[PDB]
Amino acid sequence: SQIRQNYSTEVEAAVNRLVNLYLRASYTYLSLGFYFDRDDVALEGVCHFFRELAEEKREGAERLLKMQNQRGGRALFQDLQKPSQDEWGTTPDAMKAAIVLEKSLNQALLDLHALGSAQADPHLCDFLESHFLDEEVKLIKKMGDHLTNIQRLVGSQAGLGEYLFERLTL
């Protein structure tokens, strides 16, 4: 590469793996969104919450891909595994799964940061901090807040509580 400078093969590979992880996350959210669009589930707030997250994750993958190219690495794509469920249960089930997923992304970002810091790659470490790390923290807090509110509600009376959350928060 005519441009590549201070960009370890280890970081390049990990960036390609993270791209896979984000695209998988986008696919999981696509499936979550359409499940809540089913006529026998019918929570349009929840549907839109997860469809908007599908788009965020995709956009995360694309920004990683752009950076890869900016640093003179080579994008390499793998099979995208299907999501881990075909049916996603109730709103708390789905929000719990979303939080699990985000923690797995966040840990992958933290791992990749630690690798860049080992590799003395400050550009990478800035890039993650600027575009990914605080976004995850903010999103996980929001999901935490949602779960707490869903759990308050559906402890009370499940069907009613799930409706009211979708109506009045989402």
Add this chain to the structure above:
Amino acid sequence: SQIRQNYSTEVEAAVNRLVNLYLRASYTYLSLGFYFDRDDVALEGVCHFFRELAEEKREGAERLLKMQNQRGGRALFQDLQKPSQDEWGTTPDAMKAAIVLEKSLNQALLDLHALGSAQADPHLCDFLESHFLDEEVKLIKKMGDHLTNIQRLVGSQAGLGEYLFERLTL
């Protein structure tokens, strides 16, 4: 007829019957709407939902009538049967009845399409596809979504759940 071309007497008759079916559907929705306007029922959201459907069905009948004339057929009107109920129960009762009605309209459209396709009448087949078939599909999905939400709510606590649906969805 000076205009009539490729327009079978079988399609003409079926169009006249479908016009009756839509006008009957509009009448059923008129009765549904005013029932929910009663002071001892008093769900204004539900009242407006069904009164707006009365108007849609009427407008369906008029578009069929216009097409009849465009193709050189003769509109022929029959008695309009009164709706099948005088009192329409609770919101889920009424939404169940609405879905039954729409499925009966949709099956009549599908039948008439099949007849036009037998009769090699592409104009008719386009006309139904453009103005009726997707509208029914969209409406039945919406009613399905509503029922699921009503059933979630009134499983919980019936009176409260019915109020909240009328307030927050309709």
Add this chain to the structure above:
Amino acid sequence: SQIRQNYSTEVEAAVNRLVNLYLRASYTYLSLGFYFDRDDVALEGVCHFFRELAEEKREGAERLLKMQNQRGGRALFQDLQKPSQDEWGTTPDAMKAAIVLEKSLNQALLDLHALGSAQADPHLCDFLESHFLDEEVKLIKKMGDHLTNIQRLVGSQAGLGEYLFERLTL
């Protein structure tokens, strides 16, 4: 399903397979776009052409998914295979591959139309005609036009011809 009407299990399955085919197509275009963004390839017109097609295909998948739900079918997702190449050669190589891909989508649409017509499913047949079939025809014509122009140019003098196409057409 409370809504499902005239919607064969055969069409439902094929719709799920077509969703996979569109998402795979979007992934192929993602890879094409980022390849032309490489500093050692550096054709920004070509990059944008393929990235805009990634988005079109994704949006195709989502419209199929919405229809699935509208008809009372169940979305079911599979693994998304990685694209068939990691490096995509020159502009004519990439446009040839794109045309192959589109013909495969178009044949899948035509197959699914034929199935709906066997199954007497006019809604499906309209849906494809309205949102997919003419879009493919228009896109394949455009790609045909592009290839002819690329081939004229790079017959002449390859590097220069590829630059001028990216500059003056894309």
Add this chain to the structure above:
Amino acid sequence: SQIRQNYSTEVEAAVNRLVNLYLRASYTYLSLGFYFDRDDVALEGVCHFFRELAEEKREGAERLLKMQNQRGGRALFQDLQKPSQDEWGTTPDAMKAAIVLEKSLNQALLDLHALGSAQADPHLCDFLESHFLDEEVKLIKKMGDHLTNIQRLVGSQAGLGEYLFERLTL
């Protein structure tokens, strides 16, 4: 110094050296720009590309100087060496030299980052990341893209390819 806090003499000196390196880079770009303004070279796109980089580098030097003062260090200026060439050849020659120069700046930034990280100086490390490191990466990518395009073109037919690049990219 009444303000100075956590600001090592080692960083202070290196900042003064980096200021020299940026001002030298601005001078090199000044010379590049006016060479392409010659009536016997006459590529106005190339002239403007390098004159705009002269200004960017100068502005880099001034931001380093401002930071020096913000941290309570003392700006110290040295002789500015003349650029390494009086005549800069063809467009690819000049873009190759520009890339060499930028890599030397980028390595100096990376060195200074590593020093701040040794010295536990997070302000410095942020300052570089925010104002310099991603700007270099973006600029080197752009120059890489340009070179690839220039090389495609002037492999074909040199004079023509150089004209077309200046016209249609710059």
